[PDB]
Write a protein that binds this ligand. Structure first.
Ligand SMILES: [Mg+2]
Ligand SMILES: [Zn+2]
Length: 805
């Protein structure tokens, strides 16, 4: 055994030792309990960043910990290969997105292997290979025949300069974020997943997830947005029926979740596309300009509530069905066409959104709810205004004295007898649009025939192979310009027909990759029935915060879809969720000659804070998440080249808990490396003074007071580490517990015979307790202390007797 810790000399050897033993290559062995530990598979952007290393080290700790406890652990790895970054790099470097992707995959796979992750590489998948996406095309055709996937027209943002479709997040003040040209609203036929049919099932099944974070389940409930309310019809006044046709000339229909406050309605609001808005705007240019501004808006629902609410009066009036009040109709910008009736009622006294709207335009506020002896202030909103639980009705005539649910049914009874309303359940959830006007994505298995319509590609002719010999030019997506691709024959009649040129949303690949890992080479279905039965569902999921709501919802949707097709048996894909915190770092900038700032990477600077090149001082700015925005990203390959994989893994797990943000620190990295030097020195000095012995075990009566205390600290540390790994999922404190154990070991005389046995017992446990964190040095140190296989010795057991005083 060498005297000095040198990770470059032991880490390649430890990996080949695990590779030859094939401890990470697992099968459906019924003689062992299974454990599926899944980390979110990376996008092949070119090289790993710090978020990758932290995510997959967290997953490797939980995987190696469960492996030492006898579990048959599957920890797979793949590549979320589709996306736009390959197209943009293709337009910059003039290469093909496929070749650019496959090279990034090979390089990043070498980096992941160098980190020593216990990964079953025989289950590796790449979503851009036809061997993978052929099965999401298959499920598309099956759900298309059933109607779960359908085709309808939708509105998109067209950039006429870049000749591409943009999302609302890429539109700023009505212009494209790159071209700066005014976007155009176009209606094109697209494909949709009828996810609203599974809304009740997606909402109720959240109760089965006993181990999910309550805030994550709450975000799923809000996005689905189930509400039990009331449909209410306000009769249009005789002096406001001009220009209206059909039912819109008779009544204005609205939906409300607070029918107990129907007596407190002071005005109604309609969307810009509502027929009442169209009729009143026929002779009013202000209303026409307001309607045009609402239609030209490009607000994302993540910023919908942050939008300033605006409205215009119409001069048209409707009649409240309960008290007969005449209420003026307003055109509001927050009322969305397609959401319910496209019209709402307004109660400013018990809805803060209506309170701010009425206070702006000085609209009346009528109180109809009372909570105790609390005073009602018409010029200041209070939280109890919207209380549905402890409220009682006032200023409501016959409805006075009733609570929420009694007034709900009583209002329902009054409206149904008049034929002016009935209860209704609504959902904020929209259907899932999957059509993307991009090249680098999974093709849509639809052929357009003028005599047969939109016919699905039969299962024999799948996949619809995306051509890889394509270099995007920018002026339009390539698929719509390649007749050699879209010109084909109709699979129903054999006549001339055109393939679908749009590609699928990349969320589709991530909605079922956890099932493909179970049988990645299965060619008769999405997943074999044998492997799905054994592995069941993912026991532990580790990923980031980005797009968590949509990804989880889509993955839970695909699970129930595949279950209904008879492919899987579970109702939920993920039993446990661990979302890691971001990695932040300090930023550095030097002021410009044009009134700006140029941001410098931390690798090109040294703290005296001075630039590393010209030696001119550079401003050290604030800390934020590593990104190419302010050039603050630290390459983990430089961290591995300098200290090794074990130091990188240890610093990640020790600097902060997994959920908390990790702040980059050069001193913290050195401290992790010095501890690995200390651990190597401890084992080396122990073996230099006599070599290994048999670890102490059994009855400890007769040991000295000093040696009994060390065994107490030892088996107390083992209990604390097991709780940190298996329950708390707090790996930083577990490293601190082992450090305290080594501290007391240093202060203890282990020179006696039984003292050497206690020392052997202490060291054999410490290297096994840190094996999930730093497996390379622990495997190397374990072979010096004991001749058995580390994974066969298992997780260290707690000696209960070593705790009785
Ligand atoms: Mg349960
Ligand atoms: Zn045909």
């Amino acid at each position: 055994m060498q005297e000095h810790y040198q990770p470059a000399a032991i880490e390649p050897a430890a990996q080949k030792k695990w590779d030859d033993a094939r401890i990470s290559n697992v099968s459906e062995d019924a003689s062992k309990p299974k454990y599926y530990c899944l980390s979110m598979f990376p996008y092949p952007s070119g090289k790993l960043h710090m978020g990758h290393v932290r995510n997959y080290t967290i997953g490797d700790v939980l995987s190696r910990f469960k492996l030492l406890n006898g579990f048959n652990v599957m920890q797979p790895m793949g590549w979320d290969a589709f996306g736009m970054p390959a197209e943009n790099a293709a337009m910059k470097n003039n290469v093909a997105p496929a070749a650019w992707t496959y090279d990034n995959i090979e390089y990043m796979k070498t980096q992941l292997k160098s980190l020593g992750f216990a990964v079953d590489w025989e289950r590796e998948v790449a979503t851009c290979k036809p061997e993978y996406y052929r099965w999401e095309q298959w499920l598309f055709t099956k759900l298309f025949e059933k109607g779960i996937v359908y085709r309808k027209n939708g509105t998109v943002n067209w950039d006429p300069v870049d000749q591409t479709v943009l999302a609302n997040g890429q539109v700023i003040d009505g212009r494209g974020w790159r071209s700066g040209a005014l976007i155009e609203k176009r209606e094109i036929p697209m494909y949709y997943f009828k996810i609203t049919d599974y809304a009740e099932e997606l909402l109720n099944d959240l109760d089965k997830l006993e181990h999910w974070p309550e805030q994550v389940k709450t975000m799923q409930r809000n996005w689905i947005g189930k509400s039990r309310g009331m449909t209410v019809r306000f009769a249009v006044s005789d002096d406001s029926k001009q220009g209206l046709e059909g039912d819109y000339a008779k009544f204005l229909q609205v939906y409300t979740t607070r029918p107990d406050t129907l007596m407190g309605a002071t005005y109604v609001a309609v969307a810009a596309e509502h027929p009442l808005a169209t009729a009143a705007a026929a002779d009013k240019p202000e209303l026409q300009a307001f309607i045009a501004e609402c239609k030209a808006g490009s607000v994302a629902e993540a910023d919908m509530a942050t939008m300033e609410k605006k409205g215009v009066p119409t001069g048209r009036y409707v009649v409240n069905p309960l008290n007969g009040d005449k209420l003026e109709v307003w055109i509001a910008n927050y009322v969305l066409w397609g959401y319910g009736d496209g019209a709402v009622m307004a109660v400013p006294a018990h809805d803060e959104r209506d309170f701010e709207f009425a206070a702006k335009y000085n609209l009346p506020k009528k109180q109809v709810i009372a909570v105790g002896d609390n005073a009602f202030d018409a010029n200041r909103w209070q939280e109890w205004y919207g209380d549905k639980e402890n409220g009682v009705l006032v200023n409501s005539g016959d409805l006075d004295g009733l609570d929420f649910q009694t007034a709900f049914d009583a209002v329902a009874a009054k409206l149904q007898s008049q034929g002016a309303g009935e209860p209704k359940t609504q959902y904020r959830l929209r259907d899932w649009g999957i059509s993307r006007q991009r090249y680098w994505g999974c093709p849509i298995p639809i052929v357009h025939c003028e005599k047969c319509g939109n016919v699905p590609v039969p299962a024999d002719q799948l996949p619809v192979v995306l051509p890889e010999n394509v270099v995007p030019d920018g002026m339009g997506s390539p698929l719509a310009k390649m007749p050699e691709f879209y010109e084909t024959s109709c699979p129903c009649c054999g006549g001339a027909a055109k393939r679908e040129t749009d590609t699928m949303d990349t969320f589709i690949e991530s909605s079922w990759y956890f099932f493909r890992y179970m049988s990645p080479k299965f060619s008769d279905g999405m997943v074999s029935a044998e492997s799905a039965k054994y592995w069941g569902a993912v026991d532990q999921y580790i990923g980031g915060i980005e797009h968590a709501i949509l990804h989880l919802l889509y993955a839970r949707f695909f699970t129930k879809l595949m279950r209904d097709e008879g492919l899987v048996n579970v109702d939920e894909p993920f039993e446990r969720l661990l979302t890691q915190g971001m990695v932040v770092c300090e930023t550095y900038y030097r002021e410009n000659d044009k009134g700006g700032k140029d941001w410098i990477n931390p690798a090109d600077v040294e703290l005296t804070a001075v630039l590393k090149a010209d030696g001119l001082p550079v401003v050290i700015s604030g800390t934020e998440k590593m990104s190419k925005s302010k050039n603050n990203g630290v390459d983990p390959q430089e961290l591995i080249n300098a200290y090794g994989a074990d130091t990188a893994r240890l610093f990640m797990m020790f600097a902060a808990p997994p959920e908390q943000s990790l702040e980059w620190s050069d001193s913290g990295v050195e401290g992790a490396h010095r501890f690995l030097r200390r651990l190597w020195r401890t084992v080396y000095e122990y073996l230099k003074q006599g070599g290994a012995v048999k670890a102490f075990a059994g009855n400890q009566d007769g040991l000295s007071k000093e040696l009994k205390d060390l065994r107490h600290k030892l088996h107390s540390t083992t209990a604390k580490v097991s709780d940190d790994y298996g329950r708390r999922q707090q790996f930083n404190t577990a490293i601190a517990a082992v450090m305290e154990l080594l501290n007391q070991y240093d202060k203890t005389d282990t020179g006696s015979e039984q003292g050497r046995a206690v020392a052997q017992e202490v060291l054999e446990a410490a290297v096994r307790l840190l094996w999930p964190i730093v497996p390379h040095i622990c495997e190397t140190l374990w072979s010096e202390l004991n001749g058995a296989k580390l994974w066969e010795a298992g997780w260290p057991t707690v000696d209960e007797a070593a705790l009785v005083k």
